[PDB]
Amino acid sequence: KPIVFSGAQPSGELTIGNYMGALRQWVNMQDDYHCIYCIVDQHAITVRQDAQKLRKATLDTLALYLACGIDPEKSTIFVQSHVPEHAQLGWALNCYTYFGELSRMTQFKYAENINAGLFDYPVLMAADILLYQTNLVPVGEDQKQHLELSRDIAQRFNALYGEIFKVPEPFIPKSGARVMSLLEPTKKMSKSDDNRNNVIGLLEDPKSVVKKIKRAVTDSPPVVRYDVQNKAGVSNLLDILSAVTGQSIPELEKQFEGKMYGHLKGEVADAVSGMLTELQERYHRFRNDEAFLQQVMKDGAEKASAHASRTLKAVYEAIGFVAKPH
């Protein structure tokens, strides 16, 4: 059964696109794969930010992932800094990563505020993956180059020392749910959009959801019908609704037979907020139970440590370090 590794940014403000696409997809496959979720607080500090905000966003991310259905009895979920092997393999893999490889990274694309954490975080990301003998990494478009570096480092290291690492593969199949930006239905709804009226975050209240749905773009008589060319905005709203409800697009078209665009946005907001209401309720239950979150964090980090230490011990043996006396 394959090992799957995902990193979760504590600063990431997740959206209904993330939840109904990737997260829903992976929540349903936790018995099919050995899923590992790593909240990457070591990657976060490559962007200077308030310390207390970062502490809180780490705990918010953990509760939010648990709210969405990550089950820590099935999956391994942990905080990156709680497992020292990441930094250790991160340093070691530096020595096997070309300087040019890092400088040709587009996500790194100065000498006045580029801290070296921003420059070197692809190697840390490689270390995150290789520690766990990872077979599959679900990567978005802007993470494809980073995944390729990981495979390049792993095969380079393996060529010198043997099958120490598994070469990770991208996880190819996409969720299927189609969620696009509210004001730009040519672009996909993205958690990292600076324009937040483009997205519906998971913790938003029904009154806020009504506001952003109500300002979702539309077209001319008017008719509710799926056409990603002529009626892209209307198509996105049918896609979100179908994503929330499970109704087919042809079914939804007959539901909105003779109804107008306001009733569609009203039905979309009602369904999205309904979904977000049970999600938020679970999120607050987990988020206010400090003993619970401590227990998940402790359990997951120990599960993760067992695998990471095995790998790092193999790396150190191969490289030629004297083993730490036991």
- Give the binding site for ligand TYM (CB under 6 A): 5-9, 17-18, 20-22, 40, 43, 125, 128-129, 137, 139-140, 142-143, 177-179, 188-189
In angstroms, what is the minimal distance from the CB of 156 to ligand A1EHN? 18
What is the 8-class DSSP label of residue 201? B
49 binds its own copies (CB under 8 A): yes
Residues in contact with 81: Cβ distance below 8 Å, sequence separation at least 6, in sequence order: 41, 42
Report how far residue 25's alpha carbon sits from residue 274's, in angstroms, rounded to the nearest whole number. Answer: 20
Least separation in angstroms between residue 77's CB and its own copies is: 13
Q: Give yes or no for a contact between 23 and 14, defined as CB atoms under 8 angstroms apart.
A: yes
The radius of gyration computed from the CA coordinates of the chain, to the nearest angstrom, equals: 22
Q: Smaller CB distance to ligand A1EHN: residue 57 or 237?
A: 57
State which H helix or E strand residue 25 sits in.
Answer: helix 24-27
DSSP code of 173? Answer: -
Q: Which 3 state secondary structure label does DSSP give 39?
A: strand
Among positions 7, 13, 41, 66, the unique one binding its own copies when judged by CB under 8 A? 41
Partner in contact with 168, chosen from its own copies, ligand TYM, ligand A1EHN, none, beta carbon below 5 to 8 Å by kind? none
Closer CB to ligand TYM, 6 or 75, in the complex: 6
Distance of CA 325 to the CA centre of its chain: 38
- Residue from 25, 30, 81, 143 in contact with ligand A1EHN (CB under 6 A): 143
Residue 34, beta-bridge partner list = 3
CB 260, min distance to ligand TYM, A: 26
Which residue number is nearest to ligand A1EHN in terms of Cβ? 7
- Measured from the CB of residue 255, what is the shortest distance to its own copies in angstroms? 44
* Residue 298, binding choice from ligand A1EHN, its own copies, ligand TYM, none, Cβ under 5 to 8 Å by partner class: its own copies
Instruction: Tell me which residue has tokens 């509760």.
Output: 63
Q: Kindly list the distances between the CA atom of residue 126 and the CA atoms of 123, 206, 235, 241, 307, in Å, as whole numbers in the listed order.
A: 5, 40, 38, 37, 16
- Residue 322 binding partner per list ligand TYM, ligand A1EHN, its own copies, none, with a CB distance cut-off of 5 to 8 Å that depends on partner kind: its own copies
Q: Is 162 in the site for its own copies (CB under 8 A)?
A: no
Rounded Cα–Cα distance for residues 271 and 282 (Å): 18
Site for ligand A1EHN contains 46 (CB under 6 A): no
The DSSP letter of residue 322 is: P
Q: In this structure, are residues 165 and 157 in contact, taking their beta carbons and an 8 Å threshold? A: yes
Nearer Cβ to its own copies, position 33 or 161?
161
Site for its own copies in 85-124 (CB under 8 A): 85, 87-88, 90-92, 94-103, 110-120, 123-124
Question: In terms of C-beta density within 10 A (0-12 exposed, 13-18 middle, 19 or more buried), how is residue 188 classed?
Answer: middle
Residue list, annotated binding site: 9-11, 17-18, 128, 140-142, 179, 188-192
Residue nearer to ligand TYM on the CB measure, 107 or 288 = 107
> Do strands 136-137 and 169-170 pair parallel, antiparallel, or not at all (unpaired)?
parallel
Which of 3, 14, 20, 129 lies at the binding interface for ligand A1EHN (CB under 6 A)?
129
